Structure formats: structure tokens, C-alpha cells
Amino acid sequence: NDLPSSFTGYFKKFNTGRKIISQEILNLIELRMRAGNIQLTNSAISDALKEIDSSVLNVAVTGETGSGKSSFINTLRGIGNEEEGAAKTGVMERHPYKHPNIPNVVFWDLPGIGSTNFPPDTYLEKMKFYEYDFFIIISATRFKKNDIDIAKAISMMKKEFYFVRTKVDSDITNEADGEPQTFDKEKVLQDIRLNCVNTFRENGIAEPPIFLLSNKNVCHYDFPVLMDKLISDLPIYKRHNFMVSLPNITDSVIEKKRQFLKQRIWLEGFAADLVNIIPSLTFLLDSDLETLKKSMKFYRTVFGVDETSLQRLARDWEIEVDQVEAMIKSPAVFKPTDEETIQERLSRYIQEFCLANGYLLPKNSFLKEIFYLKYYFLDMVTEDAKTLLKEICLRN
Numbered sequence: 001n002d003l004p005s006s007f008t009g010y011f012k013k014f015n016t017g018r019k020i021i022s023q024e025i026l027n028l029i030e031l032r033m034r035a036g037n038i039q040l041t042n043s044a045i046s047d048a049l050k051e052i053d054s055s056v057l058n059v060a061v062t063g064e065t066g067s068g069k070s071s072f073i074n075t076l077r078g079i080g081n082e083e084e085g086a087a088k089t090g091v092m093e094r095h096p097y098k099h100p101n102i103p104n105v106v107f108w109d110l111p112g113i114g115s116t117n118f119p120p121d122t123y124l125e126k127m128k129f130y131e132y133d134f135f136i137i138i139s140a141t142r143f144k145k146n147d148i149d150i151a152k153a154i155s156m157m158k159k160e161f162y163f164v165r166t167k168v169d170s171d172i173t174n175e176a177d178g179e180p181q182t183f184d185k186e187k188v189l190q191d192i193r194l195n196c197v198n199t200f201r202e203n204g205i206a207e208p209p210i211f212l213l214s215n216k217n218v219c220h221y222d223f224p225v226l227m228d229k230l231i232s233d234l235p236i237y238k239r240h241n242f243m244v245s246l247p248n249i250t251d252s253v254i255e256k257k258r259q260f261l262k263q264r265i266w267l268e269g270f271a272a273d274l275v276n277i278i279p280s281l282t283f284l285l286d287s288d289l290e291t292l293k294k295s296m297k298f299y300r301t302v303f304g305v306d307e308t309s310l311q312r313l314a315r316d317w318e319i320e321v322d323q324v325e326a327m328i329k330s331p332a333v334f335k336p337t338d339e340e341t342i343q344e345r346l347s348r349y350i351q352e353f354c355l356a357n358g359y360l361l362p363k364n365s366f367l368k369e370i371f372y373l374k375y376y377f378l379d380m381v382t383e384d385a386k387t388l389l390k391e392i393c394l395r396n
Ligand SMILES: Nc1nc2c(ncn2[C@@H]2O[C@H](COP(=O)(O)OP(=O)(O)O)[C@@H](O)[C@H]2O)c(=O)[nH]1
Pocket: 063, 064, 065, 066, 067, 068, 069, 070, 071, 072, 088, 089, 090, 091, 166, 167, 168, 169, 170, 213, 214, 215, 216
């Protein structure tokens, strides 16, 4: 029940594909912790956090004009095609588009090779191939020789690529229009997937990743599967930043985000050093109070329950933003009030969190109060995200 073991034991409670950093790195930290040199130990923990936090992801998106590159980029960033910062949908060189909340996630819109006079290899060099983590090759219909050859070149250069077939919703709508209930919409998808794969393999790509989706319905088709696969292919430490940037499409995705964020709080908490003082004994320092307000804003944005996200959703709904906010809890925490009231409010949350969850550590050891409060806000915001998801699905 010693501290070093408790530190690593926390992470061991999460499933493999849900750990924030390699268990191997964590076990070395455990070793250093046992050594007792807090100087070196804190430094090692801070280094782990820095690697996670500093991770930058550069995603290349290529394909013919009109295939849906701009839309795909806006969808993953959670931005409407008509909002600012959004890649303008509609008919040069590459253009970057950073995620609005996670600047370290950058999508690059590349001009389709077909619009250039360059062979696959020259095209990739011109587009600064080595700057990307992976490539997304998009087509709204069938994949032409151009697209396929780029894929082969990328593969030959030892980088990952993914084929994304957009506008599948349009195919289903047009084929099903006026047809009896018996029309098989699922079969349309199954046929397109198999046909694409046969074509890819016929052309020399043995294991072509293919995803059929619609930029107008991120919750359906292969979008969820694509997100899981992209995260799975990334080095462990790079997953956190990309994960928190993803659209909050399912309870599973929301829960996965929470799991990653819980681990970051744990790391951050140990980096600040544990104490022997019970967390609910005193009020908070003003600096910690300000940090918590920033933390709440970040969590709300990550989970899509921030002001801007709420406005965007309820624009045309029968219930406006104020009605939507009334259905959740996080928006009320920091409504304007005096400093005493907010201090008293948080001093109660801390007692309640610890009475329900314990101190998460061996007897007499505690994280500084602010971290238990981050867990409290995280749970609150997570629950709000699920509540809102249900409301979104009923209406859109
Ligand atoms: N129905 C439907 N329309 C889409 C989809 N993706 C893109 N579009 C639309 O098709 C057009 C071309 O898309 P755009 O994203 O600008 O692709 P780009 O020209 O490759 O960058 C726009 O009118 C989009 O609104 C999709 O998955 N489904």
C-alpha cells in the first residue's frame, strides 16, 4: 500500500487503449519515486506531462476538389461550414486549420494531385510530406488511379494513410427515394466498401483502410470507427490531445475522454506533490480559484457544453440556450457571486467528492485540494455531455 505503487496502480485500472502514456514510462517513474529524490521524481513526472501536452498532430487531407475535404476538416473540428475559421466549402497550395479548442491538432487541406501536373512522388514532396503524422485520402464516389498511386507512394515512404469515401448519405437518399420500406440501405454501404477494397487490392494495396461516411452525420456510418482507428494507430502519448479534440458523438467517446482527463489530473496532482493535509479543511487560494475557473471552461469546451457550443446547437431548436443550460449543472458553478459564496460552494463540493470517492490514496496522503475539485468538475461536465447528447439525437 505504499505511495509509489498507488501512483502506478491508478493507471492500471484503465484498459490498454485508454492509458495516457506507456505503462513502461509510468513504472520507471515508480522506480524513481522509490529512490526518494523528489527533485528527480517531480522532474520525471513533469516531463511525462510535457510530452503529452506538447504533442502536435498534423493531418494531411487530400483529394479532388468537391470531394468533401473542407467539410471533413470542419466536422472533425466541430465547426460549421459557415463559421469563422472553417475551411470554406467550395472550389494553389496547402492550408492549415487548427482545432478551435486544441491548437495542437492541425488539419491541412491539400490541393488534389489531379489539379497539378505532378507525379505521385513530386506531389508529396511539394506538399511537405514529412511534416504529417498521417494522410486522409478522400473521394465522394470511386477512388481513381491518382488517389491510389498517392497511397502507394505514402505507404512506400513508411507513413500511414486512410481512404475516406464521403457523401454516402447522398447515395442512400438517391437510391432509396420513393422505394418501399424493404429497400436495403445497409446493403448499399456494404457493396461500396467491398468494391473499393477489391479495387485497392487489385491495384497493389494489400491492407487498404476504408471508411464510408457522411460529413453531415458524424454520429453514423463509419465516422465513429474512423475515430477509434486513428487514435489506435497513434503512439500512446499522442492520443490524449487528439482524443479530447474529437466530436462528442457517443457515451463511449465521452467516457473515453473522461478517462484520459482523469489520468492527466493524477499526473498533475503528483507533480505538485502530495500533502498530509485533508483537502476539505480550508478555503482555496485565489490563484487556485482562478485555475479552477479556467479548468471548468476547458472541460466544458472539450465536452461541447460550453456557451458557444450550446448557442450553436439550440440556434433553431424549440428551446433556446437558456432552456438548454437549465438542463445541466456546469454552467451554474461560476455564475457571478461574491468570493465568499463561491468559496463556500467549492468547500462543499470537496467534502461531497471525498465522502463519495474517498481520497484515492493510502491513509494520511492526499492530493492538493484543487485536484479533487478538478475530478468533481470533470464528472459534472461528463454527465452534462451525456445529457446533452440525448437532446441532440432527439432533434438532429
Ligand atoms: N450530403 C453531403 N454533402 C457533402 C459531404 N461532404 C461534403 N459535402 C458537400 O459537397 C460540396 C463539396 O464539399 P467541400 O467540403 O467544399 O469539399 P472540397 O471542395 O474537397 O474541399 C459542399 O457543397 C458540401 O456541403 C457529405 O458527406 N454529404
